Write an enzyme that holds these catalytic residues in place. Structure first.
Site, PDB file in Angstrom:
ATOM      1  N   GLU A  63       0.798  -1.223   0.000  1.00 29.17           N
ATOM      2  CA  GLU A  63       0.000   0.000   0.000  1.00 29.17           C
ATOM      3  C   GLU A  63       0.831   1.274   0.000  1.00 29.17           C
ATOM      4  O   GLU A  63       0.290   2.374   0.121  1.00 29.17           O
ATOM      5  CB  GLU A  63      -1.001  -0.006   1.153  1.00 29.17           C
ATOM      6  CG  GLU A  63      -0.412  -0.035   2.540  1.00 29.17           C
ATOM      7  CD  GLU A  63      -1.484  -0.081   3.595  1.00 29.17           C
ATOM      8  OE1 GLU A  63      -2.644  -0.105   3.237  1.00 29.17           O
ATOM      9  OE2 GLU A  63      -1.149  -0.080   4.755  1.00 29.17           O
ATOM     10  N   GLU A 304       5.561  22.929  37.049  1.00 25.95           N
ATOM     11  CA  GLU A 304       4.697  24.035  37.436  1.00 25.95           C
ATOM     12  C   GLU A 304       5.241  25.377  36.984  1.00 25.95           C
ATOM     13  O   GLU A 304       4.486  26.277  36.622  1.00 25.95           O
ATOM     14  CB  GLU A 304       4.564  24.089  38.954  1.00 25.95           C
ATOM     15  CG  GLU A 304       3.861  22.932  39.596  1.00 25.95           C
ATOM     16  CD  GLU A 304       3.924  23.018  41.096  1.00 25.95           C
ATOM     17  OE1 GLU A 304       4.789  23.727  41.589  1.00 25.95           O
ATOM     18  OE2 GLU A 304       3.098  22.430  41.750  1.00 25.95           O
TER      19      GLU A 304
HETATM   20  N1  LIG Z   1      12.385  36.276  50.619  1.00 29.30           N
HETATM   21  C1  LIG Z   1      11.413  35.677  51.349  1.00 29.30           C
HETATM   22  N2  LIG Z   1      11.185  36.028  52.634  1.00 29.30           N
HETATM   23  C2  LIG Z   1      10.222  35.440  53.367  1.00 29.30           C
HETATM   24  N3  LIG Z   1       9.418  34.469  52.902  1.00 29.30           N
HETATM   25  C3  LIG Z   1       9.536  34.021  51.631  1.00 29.30           C
HETATM   26  C4  LIG Z   1      10.565  34.613  50.765  1.00 29.30           C
HETATM   27  N4  LIG Z   1      10.471  33.995  49.574  1.00 29.30           N
HETATM   28  C5  LIG Z   1       9.469  33.086  49.668  1.00 29.30           C
HETATM   29  N5  LIG Z   1       8.914  33.100  50.894  1.00 29.30           N
HETATM   30  C6  LIG Z   1       7.795  32.240  51.347  1.00 29.30           C
HETATM   31  O1  LIG Z   1       8.104  30.869  51.089  1.00 29.30           O
HETATM   32  C7  LIG Z   1       6.968  30.198  50.545  1.00 29.30           C
HETATM   33  C8  LIG Z   1       7.399  29.193  49.485  1.00 29.30           C
HETATM   34  O2  LIG Z   1       6.219  28.640  48.912  1.00 29.30           O
HETATM   35  P1  LIG Z   1       6.227  27.221  48.160  1.00 29.30           P
HETATM   36  O3  LIG Z   1       6.618  27.446  46.721  1.00 29.30           O
HETATM   37  O4  LIG Z   1       6.977  26.229  49.015  1.00 29.30           O
HETATM   38  O5  LIG Z   1       4.659  26.854  48.196  1.00 29.30           O
HETATM   39  P2  LIG Z   1       4.121  25.412  47.731  1.00 29.30           P
HETATM   40  O6  LIG Z   1       3.662  24.663  48.958  1.00 29.30           O
HETATM   41  O7  LIG Z   1       5.134  24.789  46.813  1.00 29.30           O
HETATM   42  O8  LIG Z   1       2.827  25.806  46.859  1.00 29.30           O
HETATM   43  P3  LIG Z   1       2.708  25.326  45.327  1.00 29.30           P
HETATM   44  O9  LIG Z   1       2.985  23.843  45.376  1.00 29.30           O
HETATM   45  O10 LIG Z   1       1.293  25.679  44.937  1.00 29.30           O
HETATM   46  O11 LIG Z   1       3.768  26.133  44.619  1.00 29.30           O
HETATM   47  C9  LIG Z   1       6.054  31.267  49.970  1.00 29.30           C
HETATM   48  O12 LIG Z   1       4.690  30.968  50.290  1.00 29.30           O
HETATM   49  C10 LIG Z   1       6.532  32.581  50.574  1.00 29.30           C
HETATM   50  O13 LIG Z   1       5.570  33.153  51.469  1.00 29.30           O
HETATM   51  N1  LIG Z   2      10.113  11.527  14.127  1.00 30.10           N
HETATM   52  C1  LIG Z   2       9.029  11.202  14.870  1.00 30.10           C
HETATM   53  N2  LIG Z   2       8.882  11.664  16.131  1.00 30.10           N
HETATM   54  C2  LIG Z   2       7.809  11.347  16.879  1.00 30.10           C
HETATM   55  N3  LIG Z   2       6.805  10.561  16.452  1.00 30.10           N
HETATM   56  C3  LIG Z   2       6.822  10.031  15.208  1.00 30.10           C
HETATM   57  C4  LIG Z   2       7.962  10.329  14.329  1.00 30.10           C
HETATM   58  N4  LIG Z   2       7.731   9.686  13.170  1.00 30.10           N
HETATM   59  C5  LIG Z   2       6.549   9.034  13.294  1.00 30.10           C
HETATM   60  N5  LIG Z   2       6.008   9.238  14.508  1.00 30.10           N
HETATM   61  C6  LIG Z   2       4.721   8.674  14.981  1.00 30.10           C
HETATM   62  O1  LIG Z   2       4.686   7.277  14.688  1.00 30.10           O
HETATM   63  C7  LIG Z   2       3.497   6.923  13.980  1.00 30.10           C
HETATM   64  C8  LIG Z   2       3.846   5.968  12.848  1.00 30.10           C
HETATM   65  O2  LIG Z   2       2.662   5.541  12.183  1.00 30.10           O
HETATM   66  P1  LIG Z   2       2.608   4.086  11.501  1.00 30.10           P
HETATM   67  O3  LIG Z   2       3.719   3.992  10.485  1.00 30.10           O
HETATM   68  O4  LIG Z   2       2.501   3.072  12.611  1.00 30.10           O
HETATM   69  O5  LIG Z   2       1.207   4.123  10.711  1.00 30.10           O
HETATM   70  P2  LIG Z   2       0.227   2.846  10.682  1.00 30.10           P
HETATM   71  O6  LIG Z   2      -0.566   2.826  11.966  1.00 30.10           O
HETATM   72  O7  LIG Z   2       1.011   1.628  10.270  1.00 30.10           O
HETATM   73  O8  LIG Z   2      -0.772   3.219   9.479  1.00 30.10           O
HETATM   74  P3  LIG Z   2      -1.946   2.203   9.070  1.00 30.10           P
HETATM   75  O9  LIG Z   2      -2.902   2.282  10.236  1.00 30.10           O
HETATM   76  O10 LIG Z   2      -2.487   2.761   7.776  1.00 30.10           O
HETATM   77  O11 LIG Z   2      -1.238   0.877   8.930  1.00 30.10           O
HETATM   78  C9  LIG Z   2       2.870   8.212  13.478  1.00 30.10           C
HETATM   79  O12 LIG Z   2       1.455   8.189  13.701  1.00 30.10           O
HETATM   80  C10 LIG Z   2       3.569   9.331  14.239  1.00 30.10           C
HETATM   81  O13 LIG Z   2       2.706   9.964  15.191  1.00 30.10           O
HETATM   82 MG   LIG Z   3       0.814   1.149   8.102  1.00 24.00          MG
HETATM   83 MG   LIG Z   4       5.650  24.941  44.650  1.00 22.69          MG
END
Ligand SMILES: Nc1ncnc2c1ncn2[C@@H]1O[C@H](COP(=O)(O)OP(=O)(O)OP(=O)(O)O)[C@@H](O)[C@H]1O
Ligand SMILES: Nc1ncnc2c1ncn2[C@@H]1O[C@H](COP(=O)(O)OP(=O)(O)OP(=O)(O)O)[C@@H](O)[C@H]1O
Ligand SMILES: [Mg+2]
Ligand SMILES: [Mg+2]
Ligand SMILES: Nc1ncnc2c1ncn2[C@@H]1O[C@H](COP(=O)(O)OP(=O)(O)OP(=O)(O)O)[C@@H](O)[C@H]1O
Ligand SMILES: Nc1ncnc2c1ncn2[C@@H]1O[C@H](COP(=O)(O)OP(=O)(O)OP(=O)(O)O)[C@@H](O)[C@H]1O
Ligand SMILES: Nc1ncnc2c1ncn2[C@@H]1O[C@H](COP(=O)(O)OP(=O)(O)OP(=O)(O)O)[C@@H](O)[C@H]1O
Ligand SMILES: Nc1ncnc2c1ncn2[C@@H]1O[C@H](COP(=O)(O)OP(=O)(O)O)[C@@H](O)[C@H]1O
Ligand SMILES: [Mg+2]
Ligand SMILES: [Mg+2]
Ligand SMILES: [Mg+2]
EC number: 2.7.11.1
Lengths: 463, 456, 461
Positions: A63, A304
């Site tokens: 094919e 993140e």
């Molecule tokens: N220069 C500084 N002085 C005092 N406190 C600080 C300073 N810099 C950062 N902080 C505190 O430290 C904390 C670090 O937050 P962190 O990134 O650990 O939160 P988290 O639990 O990871 O939340 P998420 O996962 O959503 O990011 C902040 O909430 C901030 O209030």
């Molecule tokens: N360089 C690359 N990087 C990342 N992914 C790739 C790359 N080249 C191909 N692919 C992925 O691999 C897959 C290869 O498809 P494949 O040759 O298996 O088709 P097929 O399923 O045999 O077709 P048919 O269903 O008609 O037989 C593609 O769908 C593509 O998303």
């Molecule tokens: Mg194929």
């Molecule tokens: Mg954090």
């Protein structure tokens, strides 16, 4: 107990599932829906055979033209044209033309097998494959006819002795193994490639339905398509034989090391779980900083925050991340969880580790990765990462989010060796924080829940 | 990795990120879907963009609608296709729009159509071809599955010509077979699925790319909508985590709060003001928006829980003349009903207003207004899209959340979006009275104490 | 940006969903299962054009006779016979003879389209409606033939220049759009009517699948068939949380008004929830009393209790409900939840409002309605009621019983939530009231003890 000899097929992970490769002189039927990688499996099988074991082979196509087969392969760096020029690879073009659009009869498998036999003898092929068997059975639709015609094809190939990987399509995932439902009962080895759509996401998986006469790993295993084509992750193929020593490393925080009984174990996995804003990212920053302080390489994986923000936050805590990168000790990898499936995040983590060869890694947030992810897919990811990190003796620090301010999960905590909790405490109208070492396999840890502060010098734990 | 197929950009917003560079050059693409999914629109927009952006002429082939309908329908997007036809950049070929005075026997002549398409391509020097209703001639000998062979020949001929072609086909079921006859997806090199999924009481359109040969793509479905400018797709996974950061500060509009934040908000931060209703969340938003305009910066106030009249009325009470700020073209107020459209539309609206107004700051009166009647996954993706985009564009973002919206109340978002937010402010009741507290201030120090939220 | 011209094709609520009606000169396909109101939709399209405007029309029938069409229309007060006599409405009877048969077996549409064309010219029709075009294709089991002929039919009607509605049919509610699986790919505008049976209750919905040249609202929009024909509820185009004013009204309880920061917002929706026996009914009765005290009209909708019992309980609480009816200030509407479809309870509330012109409405229990319906049906009901209540500037007090998607949504759109509980304290039962939510205002947020007496609620400190 006489094992059947197998032809090793170096598609990463496949040889573990097939448990030694594909049986020699036998046909393998690879079935799947459109776009599942069936045609890539076939090329990669022959390509690896030719370059790794110096085994000449034949790719039969119905094919596609040879030009697109080669052009598509070149996206992987697989210069098939070169292998053809050298007389190692032969592509047998049995495709239909726009010129002479239709014929009075149907496809002739007797003529085909004679051509395949010739090609095998000429190029001394040991390893062959077929892109589509159904391209023949676009005629002869009666299921009883398909069964007989496939039988004849397989039997002749068996007599020749070349190991054959032949491809067929199916329509529905979790439906029939193959179209007409009379092909999988003829072939000796059957492999299923599926691309399951759940929610809005697609997941590629590989399963071996059967191998007559031999054992194999059973069930469905995930795979992706990456820099070298198909890369399968046979979770469970890794052994639970990882080393475990009493060597310790600093967490980056002196008082925490004391609470941990003298520091983290080098071979341990540490999980820091807590409420948002309790300093989870602070401990992670200090963890990778400490590695660099001791001239060890470390990789920080952020799901993140962008690199620019991580550098800025680090400066505010007295940590010069840019300098640590200049010395080639620290490396920062940033991406959104939504940018890739978890099986790819696993490949990314492993690839960055193989290239940078860190003493430590850290994941800024597992909760970032678990977004919209089923417990099965997430759990497999966590097991895979921690399993690998232990195997390679890489100290690993992961973080997660606690349900402190939410009412109404601990299925990965059985993997983690050390658990540290970060929580808010509201005291007399003020927010404060407290830290506790919840779990510490193999060592003493402080049972107390202690107040701590965060300043521009990083975390400072009080007694 | 040596080969890098040269793909042709479609300029269909978001599509080029999913396909990662557009459609493979000189190859056919199959676009399948049910009625109403936008197949025809995709087919037109492909050629239209090519013509105006890259000066690349093309041929549209129709089996179903007449050229007059194609042109008239295009006008709903402001696309003057009649003009392009007069100039000679666009050609619309009638393949099988059938006359009413029909014969007894006809059709069964795909070869003649191919010759006509080839001619049109050569004459208009077409680089892009778009074929609607390619199934209109697969209604013949369908029982013999000649479709696979007829499609094969058509695709092969298109490759020989060298033009990039977008072909459309039909589906019956959203999650059923890729195409009507179960062969098209095996013949075609590139498969794009357009869905219009009915679930619960609502329809959602999504786009997926499957079966691209020789190249890469994003996998799975990405939501899209149809706007007054054609198809607009939001490939959330294409968003890069490469946003900038700085220590530049912007005032919150409230003096005491600026002190509690350690010197105001960071310019490129996302701020989430979560609290009980009645604690002044919209008072804080109004001051945030005012400060931008006070410094001659543009700001957009998006609202779902308030009529325009209330926003202005309450602003006047405090002393904020919202109407004046609009007169100066510094303030824009965008009011909408949170349930008149899907989350992917609210996101598209937010982006559109930002792209045209070019604000320094935006605010949302209530995120929780959108977080209802939807799953947590759908809402979380909305939030990521908004916060990610706002940070990418260096727009200070102040979003709010109601903590007591419903009986199953939590002090944090049910979908856990606080990991995305850089600064979190809580608004609660104390004493009788009300108070404001900085819960999180990523990147700086903040005042841990809870104190009265007295603006002045 | 040139919008396509639209004919109103009036059907209450339809022209909001279609954003201005149906595209002019194009064919709209209305598909559905048996008993979904297809014929009725077709009749209203032509009827309204004739009565509301002055647009003559042609109704082409296959399944029944002109005599049956007229008789059924008369049930809605639509005198179609009169319109025929006047030369405004013409019914073209293409129905096969009940007794006889033709020697040719089948039927050529070319013999009909000219009769339609002739009728259009003769009566200067602008609106044409074809009921059960499917029956013209029953002779063809080839879906490719159905397309060929349906396309032909649509194309010829465009040349004529008539705006038309064709009806077709399907077997399944969530299956194929049309039984042959091709019609929706031929017709320019597709509308689907379905009548879904679920949880021992049945619902009607209308959907616009597509309009090739224009925009529309998407999703399922619930509707009912009333004495005046099809009535559709465009729930996605109303104010549910937004208000025009910032003025308070008394709840009927003085201390509660203080807890709410000065009373309920006018035109707000208040949801009083709690355990059984907590006093939900009491607040509802007190609420409508306050309205009448200020000479405002109010409607009390009841599901828990009969009128006789409501009057009696209210009387025991010092409220003379009979006097309030005599003054034409209060109206009481009692029914079982099971007495009507949920969309019809909405239609009843809507109709009673239109005639009585209340300042306030109240529902003694929403749980009464929720108990027999699906989660989606209930969420939409509340949206519909709150939509109309705000549209008409009506303060609404609803109650319910004490996460789900349905309840999070309903409580979220609600402006004020009051929690009532009856709990055990120190060996005795005791009552408490709390203002959980008060959108846009300061509120107590403190749980207060209260007693129920013959003077109504009595909140303590
Ligand atoms: N220069 C500084 N002085 C005092 N406190 C600080 C300073 N810099 C950062 N902080 C505190 O430290 C904390 C670090 O937050 P962190 O990134 O650990 O939160 P988290 O639990 O990871 O939340 P998420 O996962 O959503 O990011 C902040 O909430 C901030 O209030
Ligand atoms: N360089 C690359 N990087 C990342 N992914 C790739 C790359 N080249 C191909 N692919 C992925 O691999 C897959 C290869 O498809 P494949 O040759 O298996 O088709 P097929 O399923 O045999 O077709 P048919 O269903 O008609 O037989 C593609 O769908 C593509 O998303
Ligand atoms: Mg194929
Ligand atoms: Mg954090
Ligand atoms: N200005 C507009 N704004 C919003 N939506 C629009 C606008 N114009 C058209 N649409 C929407 O786009 C859809 C048109 O896409 P289109 O239906 O042409 O693909 P398709 O035609 O369904 O394929 P097929 O030809 O088989 O029906 C309409 O159903 C309509 O909902
Ligand atoms: N005056 C009326 N009041 C209330 N409901 C009515 C009235 N007249 C008809 N109906 C309802 O309308 C339904 C029939 O509607 P309609 O005739 O539009 O559909 P239909 O085209 O006959 O469907 P089918 O072709 O499958 O029979 C009946 O089930 C009936 O309950
Ligand atoms: N005259 C009265 N004196 C004292 N208490 C009364 C009097 N009448 C009714 N009650 C009390 O009121 C309570 C019922 O309250 P109401 O009828 O207002 O709504 P409800 O019964 O709580 O609603 P539901 O029955 O749906 O739970 C009863 O438990 C009863 O003790
Ligand atoms: N002087 C004030 N100080 C603080 N907050 C106030 C003051 N005056 C009014 N507010 C509150 O600011 C709020 C802005 O609306 P908001 O609290 O967001 O309502 P919701 O949170 O229910 O959407 C008003 O509801 C009002 O109660
Ligand atoms: Mg507000
Ligand atoms: Mg009927
Ligand atoms: Mg009651």
């Amino acid at each position: 107990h006489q094992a059947i000899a197998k032809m090793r097929t170096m598609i990463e992970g496949f040889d573990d599932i097939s448990h030694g490769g594909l049986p020699i002189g036998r046909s393998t039927l690879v079935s799947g829906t459109s776009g599942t990688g069936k045609t890539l499996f076939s090329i990669q099988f022959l390509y690896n055979g030719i370059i790794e074991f110096d085994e000449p082979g034949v790719f039969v196509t119905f094919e596609e033209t040879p030009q697109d087969i080669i052009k598509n392969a070149r996206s992987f760096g697989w210069d098939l044209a070169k292998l053809v020029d050298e007389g190692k690879l032969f592509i047998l073009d049995a495709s239909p033309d726009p010129e002479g659009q239709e014929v009075v009869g149907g496809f002739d498998l007797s003529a085909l097998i004679e051509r395949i036999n010739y090609a095998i003898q000429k190029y001394r092929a040991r390893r062959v494959s077929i892109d589509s068997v159904t391209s023949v059975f676009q005629q002869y639709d009666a299921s009883s006819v398909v069964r007989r015609e496939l039988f004849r094809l397989v039997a002749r190939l068996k007599q020749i002795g070349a190991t054959t990987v032949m491809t067929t399509e199916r329509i529905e995932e979790y439906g029939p193994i193959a179209r007409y439902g009379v092909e999988e009962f003829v072939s000796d080895n059957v492999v299923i490639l599926r691309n399951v759509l759940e929610g809005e996401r697609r997941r590629r998986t590989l399963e071996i339905l059967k191998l007559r006469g031999t054992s194999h790993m059973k069930g469905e295993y995930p795979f992706t398509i990456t820099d070298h084509g198909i890369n399968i992750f046979p979770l469970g193929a890794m052994r639970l034989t990882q080393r475990s020593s009493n060597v310790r490393v600093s967490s980056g925080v002196v008082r925490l090391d004391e609470m941990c009984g003298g520091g983290f174990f080098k071979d341990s996995i540490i999980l820091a779980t807590g409420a948002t804003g309790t300093g989870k990212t602070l401990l992670v920053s200090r963890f990778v900083e400490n590695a660099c302080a001791n001239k060890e390489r470390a990789i920080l994986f952020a799901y993140e925050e962008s690199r620019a923000q991580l550098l800025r936050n680090a400066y505010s805590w007295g940590m010069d991340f840019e300098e640590m990168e200049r010395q080639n000790l620290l490396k920062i990898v940033c991406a959104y969880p939504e940018s890739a499936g978890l099986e790819d995040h696993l490949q990314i983590i492993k690839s960055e580790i193989n290239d940078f060869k860190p003493a430590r890694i850290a994941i800024d947030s597992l909760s970032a990765l678990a977004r919209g992810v089923s417990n099965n897919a997430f759990r497999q990811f966590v097991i895979g990462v921690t399993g690998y990190a232990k195997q390679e003796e890489i100290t690993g620090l992961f973080t997660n989010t606690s349900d402190q301010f939410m009412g109404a999960d601990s299925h990965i905590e059985a993997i983690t060796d050390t658990i540290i909790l970060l929580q808010y405490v509201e005291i007399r109208g003020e927010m404060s924080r407290a830290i506790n070492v919840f779990k510490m396999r193999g060592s003493w840890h402080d049972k107390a829940i202690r107040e701590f502060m965060i300043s521009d010098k990083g975390p400072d734990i009080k007694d």
